Design a protein around this ligand. Sequence first.
Ligand SMILES: NC(=O)C1=CN([C@@H]2O[C@H](COP(=O)(O)OP(=O)(O)OC[C@H]3O[C@@H](n4cnc5c(N)ncnc54)[C@H](OP(=O)(O)O)[C@@H]3O)[C@@H](O)[C@H]2O)C=CC1
Ligand SMILES: CCc1nc(N)nc(N)c1C#C[C@H](C)c1cc(OC)cc(-c2ccc(C(=O)O)cc2)c1
Ligand SMILES: [Cl-]
Length: 186
Amino acid sequence: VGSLNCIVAVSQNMGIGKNGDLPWPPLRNEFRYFQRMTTTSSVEGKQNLVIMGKKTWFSIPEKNRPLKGRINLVLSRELKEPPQGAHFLSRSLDDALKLTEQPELANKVDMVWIVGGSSVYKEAMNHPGHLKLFVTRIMQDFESDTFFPEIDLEKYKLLPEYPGVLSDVQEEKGIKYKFEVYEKND
Ligand SMILES: NC(=O)C1=CN([C@@H]2O[C@H](COP(=O)(O)OP(=O)(O)OC[C@H]3O[C@@H](n4cnc5c(N)ncnc54)[C@H](OP(=O)(O)O)[C@@H]3O)[C@@H](O)[C@H]2O)C=CC1
Ligand SMILES: CCc1nc(N)nc(N)c1C#C[C@H](C)c1cc(OC)cc(-c2ccc(C(=O)O)cc2)c1
Ligand SMILES: [Cl-]
């Protein structure tokens, strides 16, 4: 299995959710970015693995679960079997990561993407090792009931550019935003 990555879209007030939906109106190209980044394998014959919490899983429109072209894994201590549509279920992020060493996932998996929510991000960000954070900074405040944990700027470095990612300001539906990539090593 390849590298470990987080990807998130965050409002200025650090919001990522609201009533089980995105805090902002649908941003078509932010979504395409998310889709292409998590779906694109760098290795032929392999798929990427996306890891999400239970609320993130159920906040996805039923018609689009599981996330297409990716191995979906859900984190929960409460579910006893993967929800309808899902392949895998782990108790925690670390169980999930160790699960990628097993034959049935190794060989099969290229990159690992953490796609939400708040608690899963927390765990991932503090996980030891090489980690990349793909952060979309939505440049305005939205009312939110879930939040993205602050990035420890002592561990993480912000890259000026990342290959295949535009650095300049984006805008859809009146809303400006920017694609950022952070890196650390332990
Ligand atoms: N804009 C973005 O980039 C993102 C937006 N979102 C938004 O965020 C909101 C949901 O995210 P969140 O609120 O954080 O809910 P989560 O996706 O974190 O799932 C929360 C539930 O899943 C289980 N869970 C979560 N983390 C773990 C863990 N580390 N180990 C075990 N079980 C875990 C728990 O249920 P149990 O008791 O079963 O363990 C927890 O109550 C939604 O509104 C969604 O739209 C989602 C992802 C990112
Ligand atoms: C596109 C939003 C986004 N951007 C970035 N930069 N990082 C992320 N992690 C997510 C995210 C997300 C979660 C998985 C999410 C939440 C959600 O709340 C309604 C909806 C979706 C979602 C998934 C798939 C489709 C689809 O295929 O049509 C639509 C909405 C997906
Ligand atoms: Cl596309």
